[PDB]
Amino acid sequence: SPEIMKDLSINFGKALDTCKKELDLPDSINEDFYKFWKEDYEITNRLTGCAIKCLSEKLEMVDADGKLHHGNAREFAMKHGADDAMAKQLVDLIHGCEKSIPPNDDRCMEVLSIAMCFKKEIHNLKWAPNMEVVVGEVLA
Numbered sequence: 001s002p003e004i005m006k007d008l009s010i011n012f013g014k015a016l017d018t019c020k021k022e023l024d025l026p027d028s029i030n031e032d033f034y035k036f037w038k039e040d041y042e043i044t045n046r047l048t049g050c051a052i053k054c055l056s057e058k059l060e061m062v063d064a065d066g067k068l069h070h071g072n073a074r075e076f077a078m079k080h081g082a083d084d085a086m087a088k089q090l091v092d093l094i095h096g097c098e099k100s101i102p103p104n105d106d107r108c109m110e111v112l113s114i115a116m117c118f119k120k121e122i123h124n125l126k127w128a129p130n131m132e133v134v135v136g137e138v139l140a
């Protein structure tokens with residue numbers, strides 16, 4: 001649902017300021033986060049990719065091989081309202097995106113591709129929340 005996806009989004013984005021500090025990222029990536037869920041908006045900036053990658057790592061959603069950690073991704077989804085079924089459906093979308101994307105050895109670009117593919121799948125299911133929810137109040 002969009003309600004669960006909003007809650008996941010807010011919690012995924014809560015470390016954005018911490019990640020910008022760690023990676024010394026410029027404020028030019030902010031607009032990409034404010035528009036993250038805007039239908040048909042494509043994020044292209046690799047640095048935004050590095051931020052998304054950092055956010056995923058903060059939630060321990062990257063395994064030892066650079067792929068989705070399914071158990072921890074499920075833990076995160078369920079904490080914020082997903083049942084077993086939704087957790088598995090979300091994890092299957094991400095895994096499918098990993099398998100579908102143009103391969104890229106730049107992990108910031110790889111994460112950006114997976115995030116854009118996932119966003120499209122969530123729009124396809126009509127589960128997208130309002131465009132700016134990943135940011136919530138983190139940048140205020």
Ligand SMILES: CC/C=C\C=C/CCCCCCCCCCO
Nearest residue numbers: 008009012056061062067068115
């Ligand atoms: C799990 C996503 C839930 C809410 C908001 C945004 C997620 C989009 C990025 C999905 C992460 C894909 C690759 C990094 C995650 C772990 O490898």
